[PDB]
Amino acid sequence: GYPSGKSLSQIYEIYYKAIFKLVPEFRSYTEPFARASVHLYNECKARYSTGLQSHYLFSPRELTRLVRGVYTAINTGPRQTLRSLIRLWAYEAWRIFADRLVGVKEKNSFEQLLYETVDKYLPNQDLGNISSTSLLFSGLLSLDFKEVNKTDLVNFIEERFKTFCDEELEVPMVIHESMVDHILRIDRALKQVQGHMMLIGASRTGKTILTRFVAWLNGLKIVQPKIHRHSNLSDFDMILKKAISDCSLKESRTCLIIDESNILETAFLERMNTL
Amino acid sequence: REDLIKLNTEYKLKLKNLEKRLLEELNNSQGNMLENDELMVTLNNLKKEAMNIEKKLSESEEFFPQFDNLVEEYSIIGKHSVKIFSMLEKF
Amino acid sequence: SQVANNMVDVIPMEFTDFTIRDAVVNILIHFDRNFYQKMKVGVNPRSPGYFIDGLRALVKLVTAKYQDLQENQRFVNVGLEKLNESVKSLTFEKERWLNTTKQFSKTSQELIGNCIISSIYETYFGHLNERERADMLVILKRLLGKFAVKYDVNYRFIDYLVTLDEKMKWLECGLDKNDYFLENMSIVMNSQDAVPFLLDPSSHMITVISNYYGNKTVLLSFLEEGFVKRLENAIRFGSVVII
């Protein structure tokens, strides 16, 4: 089974210990971070259960996700203040535990929880608005992964979307508060070694367009399976095989957008699993 | 009921049809004899037509609230008939 | 609201009672919020779409109506200069025609809120029942009542967007007499920024649209073999297609 909640606290201390070799000025902060991460985990697991939503399923893999998500930000960021690191930690905490959260009652519940945790383990008055909308971290504007300015980001997206609008398919849209937060979310996903993000967007939200965009910013070939009523598994197999052979033997760097419509049978989805 | 909304739109389309007929002849028969007068007796007929609309708009404000008074009784009839059709549909 | 605002950024409008742009956007939100709340059942599967297309209908409809209001206002101003040149017995009644000139300001007051209803009919109503449409209309009218926009109290969607020449053309093909079936046909034709989905058990509609486009009418079905190619031929040379 799972370990302790006190072994988990201890195990991730050693995880933070290793990554705080890169911020030695906060070597004394590894334990309350490890205790906070585990607290956040224990609480998310408790507050958001499979009784509300099926995908509400937490495990120490989240912890490992968070701890590594923290390192990668440090290893490629500006030399860090304590106010930085907790916000750096808080960003990952949001992306790991709360992106999956539906609706708003539960989403606000986590905002309060995150606040409750910092106050209990890392007591500072230097924190700001910890809501995801207010902490925006990016490597689009800086060479180092750093917290960016809301005004600086919106304008950067605006100049790049027109370009993407001109260079690629011509579709005009309104760039808005939700969309900036989401652009960074896809960006982090498409940056990590294994990058798999599934977007749950109703329809016309723009989820398919943003994906094409952020992929273009990251310099990814956007492959979209050309399926139809009279498409066989063999067709999809071919679409997949090519995209695989190009990725290794041509070093292509493709982004495969699969819509729910594209999965025509059981096997199609099984192929996606094996991948 | 049918002619109320019919002649509302028809007379207004004929008011736009006669304004065009007046402007066509005023520009053609300015150097000719006083023909415009032959359309002005049709514009004298329009004094019924312009005010026919006023006659119909006045009786509309009397007809509409009576139409809405008659929807209620038929609603009482109407609501039972669907429940009956539903029942016969279900067989 | 962020998205609505940038879509109505183009400003045909003129001062009203109370902001004017701020009011319009707040109505549409409060209508979309009321539409899904009353009509749709099931827990939060569906979200904003009609809203975008409802705004896009309004922009296309206000532009079409304000340019036609200013066109009829120009047709009575050109007749004002021509009667003043002449001045005799009947012509001074014609001059009096400030009742119409006075009437224009009241007509322009309501055109913004009239376009609100027309756009809502085209977008939200297409698939609603006789009673379902009327009832939403009331909720829209009382929303138009809360906000300081003026609407026509004696308003009729058919007469407002259908022209008597077209209304005749439709029936000539063989459209049914009913008001419901008129509104439906108007919704299909009037707006074509989007492909229309016609649902009718009796394929009496498949002929109606065929009579209207005639030779140009090429009929297909998603089930036939040659569908894949026959559509590519239909698209290349401007063929009007029903699937």
Q: Are C151 and C116 in contact (CB under 8 A)?
A: yes
DSSP for A200-259? --TTTSSHHHHHHHHHHHTT-EEE-----TT--HHHHHHHHHHHHHHHHHS---EEE---
With an 8 Å Cβ cutoff, is A203 touching chain C?
Answer: yes
Residue C128 CB neighbours (<10 A): 17
The yes-or-no reply on A/B contact (3 CB pairs or more, < 8 Å) is no
Residue A114 CB neighbours (<10 A): 24
Closest CA to C109 of C69, C78, C156, C54: C69
The two tokens of residue C14 are 């003129």
Q: Are A137 and A143 in contact (CB under 8 A)?
A: no
- C93 to chain B: nearest residue by CA? B47
Closest CA to A215 of A257, A258, A170, A255: A255
Residue B16 CB neighbours (<10 A): 12
DSSP for A154-186? HHHHHHHHHHHHHHS--------HHHHHHHHHH
Distance CA B26, CA B72 (A): 53
The yes-or-no reply on B/C contact (3 CB pairs or more, < 8 Å) is yes
- B45 to chain C: nearest residue by CA? C90
Q: Are C159 and B5 in contact (CB under 8 A)?
A: yes
The two tokens of residue B64 are 């509409």
Q: Is the dihedral of CA A144, A145, A149, A155 positive or negative?
A: positive
Chain C residues at the B interface, defined by Cβ less than 8 Å, are: 75, 79, 82, 90, 93-94, 154, 156, 159, 164
CB contact under 8 A, A202 and C222: no
Contacts of residue A25, defined as CB under 8 A and 6 or more positions apart, other chains included, come to none
Resolution (A): 34.0
Residue A124 CB neighbours (<10 A): 10
Chain A residues with CB under 8 Å of C225 CB are none
Which member of C7, C44, C47 has the closest CB to residue A205?
A: C47
Distance CA C27, CA C32 (A): 9
Closest CA to A154 of A127, A132, A187, A178: A178
- C97 to chain B: nearest residue by CA? B50
Contacts of residue B23, defined as CB under 8 A and 6 or more positions apart, other chains included, come to C79, C82
CB contact under 8 A, C3 and A177: no
Contacts of residue C212, defined as CB under 8 A and 6 or more positions apart, other chains included, come to C169, C170, C173
Shortest Cα distance, chain C CAs vs residue A34, angstroms = 37
CB contact under 8 A, A174 and C46: no
Q: Where do we find the tokens 């229309």?
A: C196
Distance CA C225, CA B28 (A): 62
Q: Which residues of C20-32 are buried (b: 16+ CB within 10 A; e: fewer)?
A: beebbbbbbeebb
Backbone angles phi, psi at C240, to 5 degrees: -80, 120
Distance CA A171, CA A99 (A): 27
CB contact under 8 A, C2 and A205: no
Please give the C-alpha separations between residue C9 and each of A183, C49, C63, C226, in angstroms, as whole numbers: 25, 19, 13, 45
Instruction: Give the strand pairing for A221-223 and A146-147.
Output: unpaired
Distance CA A19, CA A222 (A): 34
Contacts of residue A172, defined as CB under 8 A and 6 or more positions apart, other chains included, come to A165
Q: Are C90 and B44 in contact (CB under 8 A)?
A: yes
DSSP-derived letter for residue C216 is G
Please give the C-alpha separations between residue A274 and each of A8, A196, A220, A241, C66, in angstroms, as whole numbers: 30, 13, 22, 12, 59
DSSP-derived letter for residue C241 is E
Closest CA to A58 of A47, A74, A67: A47
Closest CA to A246 of A264, A219, A265, A223: A223
Chains touching chain A, criterion 3+ CB pairs below 8 Å = C
Distance CA A148, CA A151 (A): 9
Contacts of residue A94, defined as CB under 8 A and 6 or more positions apart, other chains included, come to A110, A114, A132, A135
Best of C78, C89, C94 to substitute, by most chain B Cβ atoms within 10 angstroms, is C94
E strands, chain B, where? none
The number of CA neighbours under 13 Å toward the Cβ of A93 is 30
With an 8 Å Cβ cutoff, is B67 touching chain C?
Answer: no
A4 CA to centre of own chain? 27
- Residue A20, class by beta-carbon neighbours within 10 Å (0-12 exposed, 13-18 middle, 19+ buried)? buried
Best of B2, B14, B23 to substitute, by most chain C Cβ atoms within 10 angstroms, is B23
- Across the strands, what pairs with C219? C242
Chains touching chain B, criterion 3+ CB pairs below 8 Å = C
Distance CA C225, CA A172 (A): 36
CB contact under 8 A, C52 and A204: yes
- Residue C211, class by beta-carbon neighbours within 10 Å (0-12 exposed, 13-18 middle, 19+ buried)? middle
Gaps in chain C (C–N > 2.5 Å) come after which residues?
18, 87
CB contact under 8 A, C44 and A177: no
Please give the C-alpha separations between residue A58 and each of A54, A65, A108, B65, in angstroms, as whole numbers: 11, 11, 18, 64
- Taking the CA atoms of residue C45, residue C50, residue C51 and residue C57 in that order, the dihedral angle to the nearest 10 degrees is 180
Chain A residues with CB under 8 Å of C44 CB are 103
Which member of C90, C154, C164 has the closest CB to residue B9?
A: C164
- C45 to chain A: nearest residue by CA? A202
How many pairs of residues across B and C have Cβ atoms under 8 Å apart? 20
CB contact under 8 A, C48 and A204: yes
First-to-last alpha carbon distance for chain C, in angstroms, is 36
With an 8 Å Cβ cutoff, is A104 touching chain C?
Answer: no
Distance CA A78, CA A81 (A): 9
Which member of B23, B44, B64 has the closest CB to residue C90?
A: B44
Q: Are A212 and A168 in contact (CB under 8 A)?
A: yes
CB contact under 8 A, C2 and A203: no
Distance CA A258, CA A198 (A): 9
- B75 to chain C: nearest residue by CA? C131
Q: Where do we find the tokens 């492909």?
A: C195
Distance CA A268, CA A271 (A): 5
Distance CA C150, CA C152 (A): 7
Q: Are A213 and A161 in contact (CB under 8 A)?
A: yes
Residue A164 CB neighbours (<10 A): 18
Q: Are A218 and A191 in contact (CB under 8 A)?
A: yes
Shortest Cα distance, chain C CAs vs residue A161, angstroms = 16
Chain C residues with CB under 8 Å of B43 CB are 90, 94
Shortest Cα distance, chain C CAs vs residue A130, angstroms = 23
Residue B59 CB neighbours (<10 A): 11
CB contact under 8 A, C93 and B47: yes
Q: Are A71 and A88 in contact (CB under 8 A)?
A: no
Q: Is the dihedral of CA A87, A89, A92, A98 positive or negative?
A: negative
Element (H, E) at C228: helix C227-236
DSSP for A17-75? HHHTTS-GGGGGGHHHHHHHHHHHHHHHHHHS-TTT-TT----HHHHHHHHHHHHHHHH
Angle C236-C237-C241 from CA coordinates, rounded to 5°: 90
